[PDB]
Amino acid sequence: TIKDVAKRANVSTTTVSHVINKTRFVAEETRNAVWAAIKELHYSPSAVARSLKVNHTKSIGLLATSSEAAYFAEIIEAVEKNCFQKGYTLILGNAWNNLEKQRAYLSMMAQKRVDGLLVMCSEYPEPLLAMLEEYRHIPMVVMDWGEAKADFTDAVIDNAFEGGYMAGRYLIERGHREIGVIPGPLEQNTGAGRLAGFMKAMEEAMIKVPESWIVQGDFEPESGYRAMQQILSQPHRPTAVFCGGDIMAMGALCAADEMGLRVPQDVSLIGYDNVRNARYFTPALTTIHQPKDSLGETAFNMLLDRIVNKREEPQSIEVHPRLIERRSVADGPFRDYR
Amino acid sequence: TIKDVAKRANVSTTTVSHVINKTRFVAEETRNAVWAAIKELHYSPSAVARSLKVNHTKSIGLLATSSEAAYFAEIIEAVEKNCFQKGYTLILGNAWNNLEKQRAYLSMMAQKRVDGLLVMCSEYPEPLLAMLEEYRHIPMVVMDWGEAKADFTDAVIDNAFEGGYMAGRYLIERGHREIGVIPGPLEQNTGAGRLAGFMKAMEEAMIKVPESWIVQGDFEPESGYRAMQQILSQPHRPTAVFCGGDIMAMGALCAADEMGLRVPQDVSLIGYDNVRNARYFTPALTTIHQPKDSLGETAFNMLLDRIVNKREEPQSIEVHPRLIERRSVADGPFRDYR
DNA sequence: TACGCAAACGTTTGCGT
DNA sequence: TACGCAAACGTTTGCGT
Ligand SMILES: Nc1ncnc2[nH]cnc12
Numbered sequence: 102t103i104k105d106v107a108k109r110a111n112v113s114t115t116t117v118s119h120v121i122n123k124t125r126f127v128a129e130e131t132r133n134a135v136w137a138a139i140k141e142l143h144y145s146p147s148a149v150a151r152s153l154k155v156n157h158t159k160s161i162g163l164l165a166t167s168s169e170a171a172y173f174a175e176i177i178e179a180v181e182k183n184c185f186q187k188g189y190t191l192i193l194g195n196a197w198n199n200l201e202k203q204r205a206y207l208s209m210m211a212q213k214r215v216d217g218l219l220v221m222c223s224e225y226p227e228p229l230l231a232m233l234e235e236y237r238h239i240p241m242v243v244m245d246w247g248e249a250k251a252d253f254t255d256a257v258i259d260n261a262f263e264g265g266y267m268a269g270r271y272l273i274e275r276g277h278r279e280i281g282v283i284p285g286p287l288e289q290n291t292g293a294g295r296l297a298g299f300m301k302a303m304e305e306a307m308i309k310v311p312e313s314w315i316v317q318g319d320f321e322p323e324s325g326y327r328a329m330q331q332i333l334s335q336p337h338r339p340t341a342v343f344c345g346g347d348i349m350a351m352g353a354l355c356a357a358d359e360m361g362l363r364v365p366q367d368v369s370l371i372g373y374d375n376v377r378n379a380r381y382f383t384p385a386l387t388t389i390h391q392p393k394d395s396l397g398e399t400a401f402n403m404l405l406d407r408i409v410n411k412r413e414e415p416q417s418i419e420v421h422p423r424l425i426e427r428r429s430v431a432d433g434p435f436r437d438y439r
Numbered sequence: 440t441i442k443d444v445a446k447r448a449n450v451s452t453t454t455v456s457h458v459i460n461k462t463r464f465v466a467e468e469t470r471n472a473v474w475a476a477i478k479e480l481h482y483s484p485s486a487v488a489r490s491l492k493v494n495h496t497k498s499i500g501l502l503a504t505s506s507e508a509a510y511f512a513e514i515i516e517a518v519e520k521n522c523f524q525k526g527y528t529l530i531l532g533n534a535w536n537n538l539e540k541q542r543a544y545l546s547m548m549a550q551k552r553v554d555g556l557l558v559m560c561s562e563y564p565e566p567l568l569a570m571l572e573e574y575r576h577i578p579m580v581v582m583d584w585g586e587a588k589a590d591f592t593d594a595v596i597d598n599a600f601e602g603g604y605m606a607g608r609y610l611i612e613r614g615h616r617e618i619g620v621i622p623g624p625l626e627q628n629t630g631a632g633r634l635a636g637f638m639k640a641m642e643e644a645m646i647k648v649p650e651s652w653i654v655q656g657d658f659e660p661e662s663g664y665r666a667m668q669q670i671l672s673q674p675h676r677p678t679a680v681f682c683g684g685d686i687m688a689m690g691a692l693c694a695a696d697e698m699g700l701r702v703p704q705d706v707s708l709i710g711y712d713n714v715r716n717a718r719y720f721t722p723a724l725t726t727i728h729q730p731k732d733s734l735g736e737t738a739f740n741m742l743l744d745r746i747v748n749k750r751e752e753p754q755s756i757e758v759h760p761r762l763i764e765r766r767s768v769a770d771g772p773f774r775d776y777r
Numbered sequence: 778t779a780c781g782c783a784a785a786c787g788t789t790t791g792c793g794t
Numbered sequence: 795t796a797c798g799c800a801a802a803c804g805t806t807t808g809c810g811t
């Protein structure tokens with residue numbers, strides 16, 4: 102079809118190409134006509150064709166887990182923002198922690214010849230790690246590991262452990278000593294990681310958390326509801342609770358209200374993520390904030406580096422969580438005794 | 440690189456191709472070797488190359504507005520689900536209601552040669568309609584219009600008006616006659632549409648809504664907070680409020696709590712959307728539910744039809760909202776008098 | 778000076794035999 | 795019977811002149 106344009110303009114396609122890509126000098130005169138034709142012909146340069154010669158599609162694939170969950174959602178939108186301004190095209194794929202689904206999208210991606218790969222799989226078993234490696238050839242970065250699980254990728258690490266530790270400390274310094282927790286899937290970094298961080302703070306305080314006070318969640322509002330319930334649904338209950346994620350917390354808030362418990366007057370709740378609208382939780386959620394934007398930006402960045410500056414050596418960049426004081430927590434019984 | 444495979448197997452690439460695509464019969468023997476090589480060579484058929492001959496990329500572009508907002512998010516995830524199972528690749532682009540941004544993504548899309556186009560732009564001014572038409576050639580469907588704005592697209596219509604009407608009716612039948620409303624951007628269908636529907640119910644009831652009781656929102660939690668405030672922040676206030684979107688409502692809930700108002704005992708609130716987690720609002724939100732999944736499914740479907748069955752004539756498919764009773768509403772002063 | 782030729786990028790596919 | 799040839803799809807780009 103460029104052939105069709107070169108003709109209208111009565112010049113070589115090479116020429117057409119050159120003016121389209123400003124890749125060498127062209128007569129104004131000449132230039133014009135081409136555009137002229139480019140317009141009537143209503144021309145649209147085929148990227149697939151181009152991508153065929155130039156050897157880069159100028160698009161990146163997001164091998165995600167899910168994309169609705171507030172958390173995930175924020176990141177994605179971030180990453181995308183980046184792709185847009187640097188000319189990249191985002192190909193979004195949720196794998197739902199389904200291996201087949203993952204091997205699937207992966208290969209679809211390779212075939213669509215993605216310039217690079219962003220990875221947010223939540224859980225990383227050997228079987229997944231393995232598949233992953235078969236694609237080392239294609240530049241990639243995993244945005245959700247605690248440490249550097251592999252040598253073939255760039256990694257961005259959130260410090261979820263120091264975040265767990267922060268959340269715990271706060272409780273302590275507020276007077277709390279009877280504290281429960283609803284962690285997220287221990288196979289995930291944001292799960293095991295955050296929890297552990299929180300658990301260290303307790304040991305430092307010689308605070309023991311009775312097993313009946315820790316209930317697993319999965320990050321979905323419902324998981325929180327159940328746990329919160331289960332916790333306050335017992336003879337003896339904590340005076341403060343640490344919730345591994347904002348949404349689940351939102352779930353733990355609802356349930357307390359429903360058991361007619363008061364927050365924070367009856368129970369104190371600290372969450373984790375600081376999702377765009379935790380502020381509008383009732384009451385306004387006190388939580389640890391994860392820098393989701395920077396997280397995305399930093400991932401798309403390391404990736405571009407590898408891409409353009411053809412880097413070979415794996416990289417890894419830390420990012421830092423931080424406490425956000427809201428209205429869901431209140432001084433515990435030992436505040437004044439410290 | 441297929442050339443590299445044909446060689447290992449010592450057969451024609453045509454052959455390699457044939458066994459890869461099961462496009463004609465091949466000796467088991469022959470078949471094997473190819474795979475054999477296909478494996479060692481660690482081969483990955485280039486879709487760009489293929490897409491070049493076959494003339495279809497097997498990917499669809501989502502020209503969205505935003506992708507974080509719960510609403511949007513749910514849809515997208517839906518649509519994507521569909522693309523995955525029918526082999527399509529999703530290219531997601533948020534235009535933020537920025538014309539340039541839109542013309543941009545659009546053309547990027549055309550160039551990436553998308554098999555079809557899904558459109559969720561929120562607002563549609565002539566300038567946007569116009570650009571849009573320049574792409575009639577590429578099959579497309581707009582998932583957020585009230586009626587059929589154009590003749591060159593397939594449309595799926597939500598019936599947001601009948602939804603507004605439903606929400607109003609409910610209030611009425613619950614005993615309410617003093618009711619306020621926080622609508623969303625009147626330029627959007629889910630804005631003007633829903634409101635109007637609600638407004639008809641009032642006229643039918645000879646209920647007049649004083650201007651001081653209607654406050655625009657933008658769908659973001661914050662907009663709701665302000666409005667809710669503004670409303671209850673007056674000498675005379677409604678006994679019930681209709682909120683154009685769940686998130687904003689969530690915002691209107693927070694504010695009441697903060698002005699120490701009780702919901703629903705002090706104010707009744709009905710929202711709109713029934714987002715995945717409105718159930719976990721505090722209190723559990725009573726709202727109108729939009730079938731977001733079916734919405735996506737139905738869009739990806741009409742689109743596939745056009746695509747595959749090369750349809751030419753625009754189509755349009757209705758979808759229906761429905762009331763979801765929760766805990767945010769309570770009988771008003773006239774319940775017993777009817 | 779300002780431009781055009783033709784090979785190449787990696788596939789699929791109509792004819793053949 | 796089971797397979798191979800070669801043209802084509804739409805670009806970019808190293809040489810030329
Ligand atoms: N996997 C996950 N899902 C939702 N919110 C999260 N916060 C941290 N990890 C998360």
Ligand SMILES: Nc1ncnc2[nH]cnc12
Nearest residue numbers: 508510561629658684712
């Ligand atoms: N544009 C929009 N944003 C968020 N929620 C919505 N519900 C209906 N339309 C919406």
